[PDB]
Structure formats: C-alpha cells, structure tokens
Design a protein around this ligand. Sequence first.
Ligand SMILES: Nc1ncnc2c1ncn2[C@@H]1O[C@H](COP(=O)(O)OP(=O)(O)OP(=O)(O)O)[C@@H](O)[C@H]1O
Ligand SMILES: Nc1ncnc2c1ncn2[C@@H]1O[C@H](COP(=O)(O)OP(=O)(O)OP(=O)(O)O)[C@@H](O)[C@H]1O
Ligand SMILES: [Mg+2]
Ligand SMILES: [Mg+2]
Ligand SMILES: [Zn+2]
Ligand SMILES: [Zn+2]
Lengths: 99, 106, 304, 302
Amino acid sequence: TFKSEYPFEKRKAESERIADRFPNRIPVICEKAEKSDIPEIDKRKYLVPADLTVGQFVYVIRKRIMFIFVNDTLPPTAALMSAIYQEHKDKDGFLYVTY
Amino acid sequence: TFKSEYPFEKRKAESERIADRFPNRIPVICEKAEKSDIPEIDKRKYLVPADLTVGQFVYVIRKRIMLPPAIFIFVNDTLPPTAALMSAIYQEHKDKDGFLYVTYSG
Amino acid sequence: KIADQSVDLNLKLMKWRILPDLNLDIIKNTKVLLLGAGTLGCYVSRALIAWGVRKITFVDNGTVSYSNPVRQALYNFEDCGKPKAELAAASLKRIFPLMDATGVKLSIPMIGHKLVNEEAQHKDFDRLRALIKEHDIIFLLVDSRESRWLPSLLSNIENKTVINAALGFDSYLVMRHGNRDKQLGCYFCHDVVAPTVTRPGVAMMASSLAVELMTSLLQTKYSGSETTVLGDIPHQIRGFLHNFSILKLETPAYEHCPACSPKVIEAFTDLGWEFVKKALEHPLYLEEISGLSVIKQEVERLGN
Amino acid sequence: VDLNLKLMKWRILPDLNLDIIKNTKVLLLGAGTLGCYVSRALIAWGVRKITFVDNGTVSYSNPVRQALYNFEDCGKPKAELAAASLKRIFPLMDATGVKLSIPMIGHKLVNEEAQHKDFDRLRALIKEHDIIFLLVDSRESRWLPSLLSNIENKTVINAALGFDSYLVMRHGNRQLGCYFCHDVVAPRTLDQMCTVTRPGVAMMASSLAVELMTSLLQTKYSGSETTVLGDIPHQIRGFLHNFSILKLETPAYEHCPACSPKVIEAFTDLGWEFVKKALEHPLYLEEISGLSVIKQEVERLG
Ligand SMILES: Nc1ncnc2c1ncn2[C@@H]1O[C@H](COP(=O)(O)OP(=O)(O)OP(=O)(O)O)[C@@H](O)[C@H]1O
Ligand SMILES: Nc1ncnc2c1ncn2[C@@H]1O[C@H](COP(=O)(O)OP(=O)(O)OP(=O)(O)O)[C@@H](O)[C@H]1O
Ligand SMILES: [Mg+2]
Ligand SMILES: [Mg+2]
Ligand SMILES: [Zn+2]
Ligand SMILES: [Zn+2]
C-alpha cells in the first residue's frame, strides 16, 4: 500500500508541497480493494483538479484498467473531489480512495 | 413471559395434549414486544385452525386489544407474509415445547 | 398495404434493431376482451393497438357523459349520449382502420344485488361467457369489485388469462389471475386473506403497465427464471403517485377465496347459471360454499 | 370536467390548489407520443391554455402511438392538428399549435435568416408561458429550449424515452441540475432518435411528468420537500423490464454546456451570435463552459 511504502513525515511533506506548487489540484491516492479482481492501474497518485467530479474520476480509472467506495460510502457521481477532500482528507493531506 | 412462567416439562405436556383434543389446530402463544408500546393483550394462548392465514390472525389480535387503525406480527425475528398459513409457519418456526411463539408490536 | 405495414413496420424495426427474439406475432394475434370502456379501457386499447393487436372487443353498458371525454381517451365532446362500447370500437377504427374492433352493449351481472330480470340477466350471463371463451386475454377494467366476480370466475373456468387493473385516489393495482394447472392468487384472494375520483395520472399508469405486463407474459419464459425476453412477469404491480413508487408482489391462491376456491369452481361446473344466480343474490352463500363461513365464525371464537 | 376535479379537493385534499394548475400556461415542445399523452393528462387536470410546438407532419405510423391523431390526419402538420384535437375533446380549450423548427445543436445552419426568426419565436413562446415541457426525441433539440427557459426563469420538465425505460426530470433555476448536467458529470437507447420504444413507456413518462408538475405547483410543507400531492423529485427513472422506478437528485454542474454560468453570461452578452456559433460548433460551447479544460485534464491524468 501507499501508507506502507512511505512514513507520515514524508507523506505530510509532499502533500504540503502539493498545496504550494499545485494549489488548484487535490492529491488523491487510489488502490483496488483486496476483494476486487479488477486490474490495478499503472498509477496510484493523482493531482486531480478541485472541480473534478467522481463520475469523471471513474472514467480516468476505467481508462487506466479497462464502483468506487470510500470508507464504506460510495459518494454520488455528482460530488466534487474538492468537496470530498474537505471531509475525508487524511492527517497527512492526501485523499485515499478504493474501488 | 409464557416460557418464564412454566417449565418445559409442563409446556411440552400441554402441547402434546392439544394435539389429541384438537388435531387440526396449531397452539400459538402471542405476547407483546417488551419494547413497543401497544396495549398489552389479555389472552396469550390461542388454538387457531391450521388453515388460518397470518392476516386473519392479525385481525383477531387487533380486535383482542381494541386497536384502531398499525399491527405487526413477528415469528423468530422475521415478518411472515400475510398470505402464509399458520400451519406452514408452525411447521417451520415451531418451538421444542410444541408451541408456535409469535410477537406483536406497533 | 401501407395501412397495416405502418404499425407493423414500426414494430419490426423495434424487434430487429433491439430485441430479435421478441415474438410480435403472438401479441398481434392475441384476441383481447376489454371489460369496461372507461378511462382504463380507453388507455389500454390505445397501448394494445400500438403493440399491433388486431382484435379488440369492448364490453360496456354505459353511455358517454359530458365529463367523460376529458379523461376517457376515445371519446370527444360531440359523443355525449352515445353508447360507449360501439363508440369505443368505432373510435379505434378511426385510429387504425384495419382493426377488428367490436363493441358489445352488455351488463355484467353484479354480485350483491337482487335480479331485476332473470331471463335477461341469464342471457347476459351466457353472452359474457361466450365472449370470454372466444377471446385469449381478458382485461378486467370495471371500477367495482361486485362487477369483477363473475368475469373472474368465468375466465378461470374458461382457462383464460385475466389482467386486473384497479384504481385508488393516488394508487393503482395491476395483477394477473392465477390459472389451474402452485397457483397464483386472484383479485379476491387478498381481502379475505387480510381482512380489515382519482388523480388523472393513476389510470394512465395502470393501463400501460397492464398492457406491458401482458406483452411480457405472452413471451416464452426462460428456464430457471420467471423472466422473458421482455423482462419480469410479476403477479401484482402496486404503484403510488404521492411518492412515485412501484412495488411488485406475489400471492398464492387462497383455498377459501369466494372467487377461485376449488369448491366454487366445482359448484359452478355442476350447476352453471343455477349456482351463479344464487351467488349473485346471496353473497353469503358463496362464503359458505368456499369455506370462508367457517373461517369467519372461527375468527369470532378466537376474538371473544 | 371541472366537477371531477372539484370533488378531488374538498372530499379528499382540501389544501389542494386547483386554480394554480388551471391557470398555468403550458408550452409543449414536441407533439409526438409524449406531447399527445401529456396534453391529455393536462386537460384532465383542468389546464386551460396549452400550446403545441412541432415542425413535423403526421406519418402513417403515428396515430396508434400519438393519441391526438387519426388515420385520416396523415400528412397534416402536427402542432395545429393537436390543438384542434384538444378542442374536439374540450371546446373551451385555449389550445393553439405553432409550426416551428427548434434549431438543433451540432448542425450547420441551413437558413440563418429563417432560423434566427425561429430562435426569436421560440424565446417569445417560452417567455409567454409558465411551464415548458421538453418532449422532443433528441438531445440536440433540447439544448436551445433548456437554455432559453433558464434565461427566462421558467420551469422546465424534461421527458425522454428509451426502448423500455424513461426519464422525467425538472430543471433547476438560478440549484438542481439540468438534462445536460448528468452526461458530462458521468462520462443507451434513451433519447436516441432512431429508437422505437415499447408503447407503454410514453404513457408512463407522460403521466408522471404531469403529476410531477401538479405537485410542484403546490406549496411546500415547511421543513420538508413535500406538498399536499406528495414528493417533488428532481429526476424519475422508470424501467419496464423489472417494473421499477428510481428517483434521483443532482446539483447543477459548473461546466455544463447548457446551464453553466459562463454559458448564461455568453448568451446574455452576445445573444444570437453566441447561439449561432454554439449550434454549428458544439466544441466552442465546451470551451465557454470550461468543459474543454476539464476534458484535457481527464486526458492528462489518463
Ligand atoms: N356491470 C357492468 N357491466 C358493463 N359495464 C360496466 C359495468 N360496470 C361498469 N361498467 C363500465 O365500466 C367503465 C368504467 O369506467 P370509468 O370508471 O373509468 O369511468 P365511468 O365510471 O364511466 O365514469 P367516471 O369517470 O365518472 O367514474 C364505465 O364505462 C362503465 O360503463
Ligand atoms: N428540432 C425540432 N423542432 C420542432 N419539433 C421537433 C424537433 N425535433 C422533433 N420534433 C417533433 O417532436 C416530436 C417527437 O416525438 P415522437 O418521436 O413521438 O414523434 P415521431 O418522431 O413523429 O414518431 P416516431 O418516433 O414514432 O417516428 C415529433 O412530433 C417531431 O415532429
Ligand atoms: Mg367509475
Ligand atoms: Mg421520433
Ligand atoms: Zn381467489
Ligand atoms: Zn446543466
């Protein structure tokens, strides 16, 4: 997993570096759940724009691997990534999601 | 409750007697849910005919407590359909003492 | 040529472009009896001809009222005073002139009433049974349950498929009757199993669902599923306008139903009109025959 | 006809406002299967003024599906025929038909002079009515009416059909999403001009669309989204294959090619000059709405 690879001090660091360099972007991290058998994509970290919707984010993942739950909660397709960021951002500053 | 008042030896004895005096009837114990606030029933032991439906058994309870128009019946933590026959539920949710235990709540 | 082809071509396009295994011919050749040419009968008949149904027969004993045209989609303002069944048939032919559209002015005898003319209502009973026997699907589209009983019994006896549509103020029930062959319930099973002016949209919803249930029901059932090429074949559809909801329900036949009880079937088979005339004037005799009498007297002994 | 409605009020729903429904001026964009069944549901609800808009003529296959036309009507223009048909039902109707082509997005202009006049007449018709029903058979015929009705702050009720499903939804006002929000927020037979639908679908969508209007016209119970007639859903999706109805609500999308504030402002400043460019070059619309920037950011992340 991403959290396993990097410690918190490095996670919170680049996150706070993303805010100053790409403030319009939102640092999001995705990885398939253990139960899902779908392909796992080529990338995990994404600097999605704040005005991006979840449904638009589904399109980017389906393109990278031919349902997207977050904390036992599948958000509406119409939800913006910036809105989900204000409520679900981790202590490091990233937005962790799964599918 | 009914099972608290009588021990199993007495319960299974009366139930096996009911099968003699009334072969085509099902012994039903009906009690109010200890949480819900519906008028407590006055009679709790019912000898209903085998072909009686759930909805017909709902009707007799509603009038047994003079409840004006909602009533729900429960058997072993499920809501049986209204079209079900009491014999079919008695065949499946029967207790070892020979009684069918049902509960009603608002 | 373009007369018949236009409607059928539209349906062929639907079949070959979307649902190749759809059976259009079974629908087209289905002979439909519409009991009631009111709001439901008018909308049902329009959906049926759009599906290519060639033979539709209206049964109705009423005349067009001044307020009918605004709700009953086959009648115009100039039609006030005219008998409904023949007019509804003529109105269908104005839409699609190749229709085998027929109207029969006929009173369905109603249970719970003293006979006003034994000879005439006997003749009406014979005509009703003959009409049901010659058709394939029977739509029960009369507003009163006392008018549903005789057609339900005759259609069951004649082994025809019945589709009931009934309206509440903001709700509707569409259901198909069980047949004799694990038998499904009929319109009268529920009220004895569970004893205790409409919004314009209700009839439009009920009519279209009833026809779409029929067309699905006419397709061959997939093995291992209660579905067809057109989808589900539910027993009952209940819809509500106030919350824009729709529920599917299924009910078994009830042994003591005053309509489809095996004893009621047996008594009709034995006596026909002789049994019917007694049931019409004394509905309590029906509950005796079906066994409901013993059930009701038993519900008393349990509740007293 | 009024007596059946009058009984509905005091015998059943005393708080039901019938006058607001009767005096609602209704514009029907489309006199096909939806327009015909919608208008019948409307007059049953007592609506007095109904205007049909259609640029078509009755085809041989129309009468069995379009409940205002008879066999003898084939070849006649639809809009005026539909209005006269309503008067055959209810002679006191204020029913009129207007033969007008709605300019469709994604097409070069065939006759700018005539299509400019049609644009003007469309806007004046939307302006003079209270409720606009969008009952055409294609997405491209929905754009301009959706924009103009939003500019004129009129309530829009959209109905669209698939082979065995339907969509009924009302447009938000300057807020809820519009018809064009979903497809760009969530990037098959529904609203496809080549789709032949199961006959019952148009009947269901039509009645629910009108029942939604009558409820929407009633006052809201405070602390709730309900009226004396029940719910006022944003979207209704019905399916025939499993006899289900699903309700859904979506917010207005910032980069929608129809209701985005930047699209509103481009129209407000440039008018027909913006509309003409949008009709012939829809990508120019996505540039104005900001969808272009979002589309190329989905591209880079992919
Ligand atoms: N026993 C019967 N025999 C034959 N036809 C009947 C019988 N009972 C009812 N009908 C017909 O069934 C139809 C029911 O239609 P519907 O209820 O939609 O409208 P209505 O009752 O005619 O008028 P309204 O809309 O004012 O109720 C009526 O046309 C009526 O004439
Ligand atoms: N751009 C437009 N401007 C004006 N009217 C339109 C436009 N696009 C479609 N219409 C009208 O809207 C209606 C669409 O409804 P519908 O699809 O039920 O009718 P149809 O296309 O004539 O019938 P069918 O689809 O069975 O061939 C048609 O009557 C059509 O004439
Ligand atoms: Mg009636
Ligand atoms: Mg079309
Ligand atoms: Zn029955
Ligand atoms: Zn929009």
